[PDB]
Design a protein around this ligand. Structure first.
Ligand SMILES: N=C(N)c1ccc(CNC(=O)[C@@H]2Cc3ccc(cc3)NC(=O)CCN3CCN(CCC(=O)Nc4ccc(cc4)C[C@@H](NS(=O)(=O)NC4CCCCC4)C(=O)N2)CC3)cc1
Ligand SMILES: [Ca+2]
Length: 223
C-alpha cells in the first residue's frame, strides 16, 4: 500500500497473509473454511496466516493454517489477467472471533464514486521497495469505467474495475495482490494489477468480485 496509513491491530479481521516461508500475497476470509485471493497468487504449499497485524512479530492472535486445496478460476488468463480470482480451502476451520472474521460477498456491484478500504502488507514505496511490518490501509474510490479505460485503453475487461486516484501517490502495490477491496461492507475487489504503483493516470485495477458471487458460492459448496 503506497500512501496509506496503519490500519490498527486486527481492525481488518478478514485480511489474511499467504505465506510460503515469507509473505507473498493477501487474501480475504469469506467463511471459516475459505479464502478469496487472486489467481496470479497461486503457489503450491500455501500457509494461510489469520489474525495478523505485525507479520514479523508473534503477537498472540495468529492462526496458521495450511491450504488444503486451491481452485483457480478456470477462465483465468495470465496475460490479460482476466478472471484473476482463486479460492483457497483451509485444512481446518479458522476460529472466528472479533480479530478473525469473514467478510460478506456482494449482493450487487458497487457504483463509481464509492469509497473502499484496500489493505495489505505490500510495497509502500512508489519508487523503490519497502515492505511494512504492520498492516496498511488505504481509502480509495471506485473510478468510472470510462476513466478506467481511458487510463488503460484496450486493457480493461468487464471483470475489472479501477479504484484510486488519478493524481498518483495512493495505491495498492506488489505484495498486496489477492487482498481485499471492501466497499460498503462487501468484498467488491481483489488486488490484481496496474501500471507501476501510485503513478499519475494509472490507477489500481481490481478483479470485480460481484461478477463471481454465484461461482464462489457454488464452488465452496461443492468442494
Ligand atoms: N494497484 C497497483 N498499481 C498494483 C497492485 C498490485 C500489483 C501486482 N500485480 C502484478 O504485478 C500483475 C500480475 C502479475 C504478477 C506477477 C507476474 C506476472 C503478472 N509474474 C510472475 O508471477 C512470474 C511467473 N510468470 C507469470 C506470467 N508469465 C507470462 C505472462 C505475463 O507476462 N503476464 C503479465 C505480466 C505483467 C502484467 C500483466 C500480465 C502487468 C503488470 N504491471 S507492470 O508491468 O506495470 N508491473 C508492476 C508490477 C508491480 C510493481 C510495479 C510494476 C502487473 O500489474 N502484473 C511469465 C511469468 C501491481 C500493481
Ligand atoms: Ca504476527
Amino acid at each position: 500500500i503506497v500512501g496509506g496509513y496503519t490500519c490498527g491491530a486486527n481492525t481488518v479481521p478478514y485480511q489474511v497473509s499467504l505465506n510460503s516461508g515469507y509473505h507473498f500475497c493477501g487474501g480475504s476470509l469469506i467463511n471459516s473454511q475459505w479464502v478469496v485471493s487472486a489467481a496470479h497468487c497461486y503457489k503450491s504449499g500455501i500457509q494461510v496466516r489469520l489474525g495478523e497485524d505485525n507479520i514479523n512479530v508473534v503477537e498472540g492472535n495468529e492462526q496458521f493454517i495450511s491450504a488444503s486445496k486451491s481452485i483457480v478460476h478456470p477462465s483465468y488468463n495470465s496475460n490479460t489477467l482476466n478472471n484473476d480470482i482463486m479460492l483457497i480451502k483451509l485444512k481446518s476451520a479458522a476460529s472466528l472471533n472479533s480479530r478473525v472474521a469473514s467478510i460478506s460477498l456482494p449482493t450487487s456491484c458497487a457504483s463509481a464514486g464509492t469509497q473502499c478500504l484496500i489493505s495489505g502488507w505490500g510495497n509502500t514505496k512508489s519508487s523503490g521497495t519497502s515492505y511494512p511490518d504492520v498492516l496498511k490501509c488505504l481509502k480509495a474510490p471506485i473510478l468510472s469505467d470510462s476513466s478506467c479505460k481511458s487510463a488503460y485503453p484496450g486493457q480493461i475487461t468487464s471483470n475489472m474495475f479501477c479504484a484510486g486516484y488519478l493524481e498518483g501517490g495512493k495505491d495498492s502495490c506488489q505484495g498486496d495482490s489477492g487482498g481485499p477491496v471492501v466497499c460498503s461492507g462487501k468484498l467488491q475487489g481483489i488486488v490484481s494489477w496496474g501500471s507501476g504503483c501510485a503513478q499519475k493516470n494509472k490507477p489500481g485495477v481490481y478483479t470485480k468480485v460481484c461478477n463471481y458471487v454465484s461461482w464462489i458460492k457454488q464452488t465452496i459448496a461443492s468442494n
